[PDB]
Swiss-Prot record:
The active site is at C612 (glycyl thioester intermediate). This is E3 ubiquitin-protein ligase NEDD4-like. WW domains are involved in recognizing PPxY motifs in substrate proteins. The gene is NEDD4L. Residues 151-184, 218-251 form the WW domain. It is found in: Cytoplasm; Golgi apparatus; Endosome, Multivesicular body. Activated by NDFIP1- and NDFIP2-binding. Residues 1-118 form the C2 domain. Ubiquitously expressed, with highest levels in prostate, pancreas, and kidney. Expressed in melanocytes. Pathway: Protein modification; protein ubiquitination.
Amino acid sequence: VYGLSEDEGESRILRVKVVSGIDLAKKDIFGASDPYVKLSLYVADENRELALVQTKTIKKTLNPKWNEEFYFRVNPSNHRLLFEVFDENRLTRDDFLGQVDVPLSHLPTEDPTMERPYTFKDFLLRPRSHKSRVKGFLRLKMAYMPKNPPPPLPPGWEEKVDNLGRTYYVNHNNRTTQWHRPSLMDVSSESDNNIRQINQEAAHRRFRSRRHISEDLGPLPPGWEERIHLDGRTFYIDHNSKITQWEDPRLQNPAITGPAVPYSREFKQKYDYFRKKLKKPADIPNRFEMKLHRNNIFEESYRRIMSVKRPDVLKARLWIEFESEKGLDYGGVAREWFFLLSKEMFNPYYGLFEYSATDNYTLQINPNSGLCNEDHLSYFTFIGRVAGLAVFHGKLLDGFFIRPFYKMMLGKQITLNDMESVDSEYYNSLKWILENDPTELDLMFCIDEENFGQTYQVDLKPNGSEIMVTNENKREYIDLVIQWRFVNRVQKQMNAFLEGFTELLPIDLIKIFDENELELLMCGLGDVDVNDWRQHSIYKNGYCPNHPVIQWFWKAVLLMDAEKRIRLLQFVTGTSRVPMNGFAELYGSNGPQLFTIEQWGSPEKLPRAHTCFNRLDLPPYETFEDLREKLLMAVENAQ
C-alpha cells in the first residue's frame, strides 16, 4: 500500500521479502563486504524489465541484514524474478556477487499478516559466468493473500584476466593486446591494415612533438647540488628536505646556519648540473654500430645490446642501420629506433608490464610475470640497459610509469598514497582501516592464497593466525599488507631493472631528483593545450564556470610555465601525458572521467588531489594572490 506498483490492470498483488544472506562469497582478502541487491521483476517470455528495485543498508559486513519487503501487482502466470547481488567495493574486478532466478509457478497458500509461516526459505546463489564464484544462501519469503556460453572468438584471439582483476583480449595473429571485444571478420584488404598504419603515423608525430628539458674531493652526497647566486656566490643545497646552505656539506659542520637563499626547485639547472657531472672516462670505441630488421627490432636487439661484455661500450655514440635503409643518420634514425623499440617493449603481450589501476594508458611491473615468461630477469635487465642508454645519450624514451615505480627506483619507502596507483580496492580498504576502527572487519593476521587449484593460509608474522587486529597496531598490519601486496612481490624484478639501469649510469646521480621528475626526464617534457583543457573540465559544489575562484584558477594555470603546468597535470591525474585524441578521453579508475574541481576544505589549507577520480579539491580563496601562492606551494610540494 506504500507504493512501487506501476502495472495495474488484471494483476495480482504479491509481496516479496528478502531476509538476509549467510556466508557470502568474496575474493578480496579483506572481504570488501559492501553488497547491494537488485530485484528485477519481469516476464519470462521476453525478459523485458518491468520492476527494478535496489537497496543498500549494510556496509562492511559479510552477512547483510536485508529484511526488506516489496509489494507489486503482477500476474504470476508468466512472470519471474531476478535477484542480482553485486558489490560496490569490487572495482576493477567482477563485482557479480551472484544471481538467483525465482519462478512464480509454485504459488503456495500464502496468507501475509494472517499466518505464522516462519519459513524464510533459503536458495543457493547461482553463477552467471565462468568468471564468477558464489557461496552461501539467500533467504526469501513470498506472500499472495488477496484476490477478486561465451561467444566464439577469431583464431589467434584469447581472453586473459590480469592480476588487477580486469579482462583483456590478446591476439597472436598480429601479437597485440586490447581491451574491447575481439574484432569481427578481418576483411583487412586495405582499410583495416591502414588503420594500424595511420595509428603508427599519428603516434610517431606525437613522439617528435615532445621535447627534452635541455632543448627547451669531487663527489657530493646524493640530493645535494650546487647553485650560483648573484654577486658571484656558490651555495650547495639539498633536495632531500628543503634545506639551503652556504658552505659545502663535506666536513664543514661548524660553518652552518647562514643567510642562505630561499629554497627553490628549478628543473633546468638541475638537469644542467646532472649532464655536467655525468662523463665517460677512459677509452672506448668511437663507433658503436648496430644493424636491425624492423619486424625483429625487439628480438635482434636483445642478442646485441645485452651480449655486450662491458657497459662502457654503451657510453659511446650510437649508430643504427635499418634493413633496406640508406638515409642520413643525423641523430634522427636513433630517435626513431628508440621510439619503435620502446613501443615494442612496453607491450602486455610479453607480460613484462601490465596496465595500471588508476588509469588505462600507463604501465607497471606485473607481479605475475613469473608465470607468463620463465626468463623475466634477462628481459628486465635488457630494458634497464635500454633505459640507461636512453638517459645517457639524451634521447627520449616513450615509456610511462606510475609514481611508486619511480619511488622504488629512487630507493624510497612505500605508503598508501603510493599503493593507490597500483590497485584501488586495496587502497580503499587500507584507508578505511586507518581512519576507522578495524574491530568491525575482525580480520586477523592471515592471508589466503590459492595456487594450482588449492587454497592455503599464510601469516605475515609468526603466530599471526592466533592474534586479532585491534587499535594501536594497525600501522604494522597495513605496512605488512603493503609489503606482501606490492613491495615484496616485485622487488626482485625491480632490483634487476635497477641493476641494469645503474650498469650504465651512476646511481648516486639520480637521487637528486624526486618521484615527479624522473618521468619527465626519461619520457621528455610534453605540451598541454590549456584551452581544450578548459573546455573539458567540469565543476561542482557551487564552483560556477565563471565563479571567481575558477576564474582565478584558470588565470593562474595559463600564467604558469610549461614545466610547472606539466607538474600540476602529473600531480592531479598521476601521469604527465594526455590522450592523443584530446582531453575528452582522460580515463579514471571506474571509467572515463574528465578533469574536475571540487569545493572542499578550509580557506587556509593547501588544495588536495585524487588521482583515482582525477579531481582537485580546492578551498575557496579571497584574491588572486592567495590562490596563486597556495596552488604554487601545493604543486611544488606535490606528494
